[PDB]
């Protein structure tokens, strides 16, 4: 695609999220860069308004799959880059097992040289002393995720589903079921993929000099499941 040529080098990234979970309003700003050649993302997120009402690890998937490394033989399956620069809408429902749900709507596109992810997140039905509002999740991401992608030809887009598992402080796990839909914003041709998945590996850390509430993410994502 024309779009894939925008990703041959290191690209600056901005992320902006506005959130409301059970009426608790918050906002996140992120900055970093992506290097799709190696499937590599480095991002730092800062909580900028109301006290973060949910654990940082529950926002990782919401807070740019256009930075996935598609092997050469799988390049015809890369919807995400093909929709650039005009971008795509990415929507999800994230169902937290025995707890509430997030509904997210994001637009991912270039603004000049910079790849931007603008997100609205709405969470409802969360339990007051559950793992999310109770802040009972460990600050880590100890489980890899396979993001299973299929074409959605009717909307000239894709759908995905996957499970993420977040460690609870007692040693147990909080499951998050994700259903995802992406559709192009622009009128250029896009790539409709064969079934495949993104193998996604994330690591969270803290900047020791940062006193604001924040999250540092290092993430490697590789398309797979086609030989
Ligand atoms: Mg209700």
Do residues 212 and 47 touch, judged by C-beta distance below 8 A? yes
How many Cα atoms are found within 13 Å in the side-chain-facing hemisphere of 166? 24
Expressed in angstroms and rounded, the spacing between residue 125 Cα and the centre of ligand 1 is 6
Task: Show the CA angle centred on residue 71, arms to residues 66 and 72, nearest 5°.
Answer: 110
How many Cα atoms are found within 13 Å in the side-chain-facing hemisphere of 61? 32
Expressed in angstroms and rounded, the spacing between residue 21 Cα and the centre of ligand 1 is 12
Which residue is it, tokens 């006193």?
211
Both tokens of 169, joined, read 């402080």
Both tokens of 174, joined, read 């909080």
Expressed in angstroms and rounded, the spacing between residue 95 Cα and the centre of ligand 1 is 15
Expressed in angstroms and rounded, the spacing between residue 16 Cα and the centre of ligand 1 is 27
CA–CA dist 165, 126 (Å, integer):
17
Total count of residues recorded for the chain: 227
Q: Which residues pair with 46 in a beta bridge?
A: 29, 214
Pairing of strands 114-124, 40-47: unpaired
Task: Show the CA angle centred on residue 146, arms to residues 45 and 72, nearest 5°.
Answer: 95
Write down all domains in the chain, each with its CATH number in brackets.
1-227 (2.40.155.10)
Expressed in angstroms and rounded, the spacing between residue 126 Cα and the centre of ligand 1 is 10
Q: Is the CA virtual torsion 138, 141, 144, 146 positive or negative?
A: positive
Q: Which of 159, 104, 170 is nearest to 137 (CA)?
A: 170
Which residues lie closer than 8 Å to 93 by C-beta, 6 or more apart? Answer: 101, 102, 103, 178, 179
Expressed in angstroms and rounded, the spacing between residue 132 Cα and the centre of ligand 1 is 17
Please tell me whether residue 162 adopts helix, strand or coil conformation. strand
CA–CA dist 98, 85 (Å, integer):
39
Q: How many CB atoms lie within 10 A of CB 81?
A: 23
Listed resolution, Å:
1.5
**From residue 159, how far is each of 27, 183, 190 by CA, in Å?**
27, 9, 14
DSSP code, position 133:
T
DSSP code, position 209:
T
Do residues 64 and 42 touch, judged by C-beta distance below 8 A? no
What percentage of the chain's residues is helix, strand, coil (to nearest 5)?
A: 10, 50, 35
Expressed in angstroms and rounded, the spacing between residue 124 Cα and the centre of ligand 1 is 7
**From residue 63, how far is each of 1, 19, 76, 109 by CA, in Å?**
25, 11, 26, 14
Expressed in angstroms and rounded, the spacing between residue 93 Cα and the centre of ligand 1 is 16
Long-range contacts of 126-129 (CB under 8 A, 24+ apart): 126/21, 126/22, 126/54, 126/96, 126/99, 126/100, 127/98, 127/99, 127/100
In whole angstroms, what separates CA 5 from the centre of its chain?
Answer: 22
């Amino acid at each position: 695609s024309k779009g894939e040529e925008l990703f041959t080098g290191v690209v600056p990234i901005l992320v902006e999220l506005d959130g409301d979970v059970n009426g608790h309003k918050f906002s996140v700003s992120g900055e970093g860069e992506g290097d799709a050649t190696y499937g590599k993302l480095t991002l730092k997120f800062i909580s900028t308004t109301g006290k973060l009402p949910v654990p940082w690890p529950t926002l990782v998937t919401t807070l740019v799959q256009c930075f996935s490394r598609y092997p050469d033989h799988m390049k015809r399956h890369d919807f995400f880059k093909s929709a650039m620069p005009e971008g795509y809408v990415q929507e999800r429902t994230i169902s937290f097992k025995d707890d509430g749900n997030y509904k997210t709507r994001a637009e991912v596109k270039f603004e000049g040289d910079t790849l931007v992810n603008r997100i609205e997140l709405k969470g409802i039905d969360f339990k007051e002393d559950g793992n999310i509002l109770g802040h009972k999740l460990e600050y880590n991401y100890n489980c890899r995720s396979n993001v299973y992608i299929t074409a959605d030809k009717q909307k000239n887009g894709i759908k995905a589903n996957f499970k993420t598992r977040h460690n609870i402080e007692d040693g147990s796990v909080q499951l998050a079921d994700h259903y995802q839909q992406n559709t192009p914003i622009g009128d250029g041709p896009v790539l409709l993929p064969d079934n495949h998945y993104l193998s996604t590996c994330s690591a969270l850390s803290k900047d020791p000099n940062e006193k604001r509430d924040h999250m540092v993410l290092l993430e490697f994502v590789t398309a797979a499941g086609i030989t």
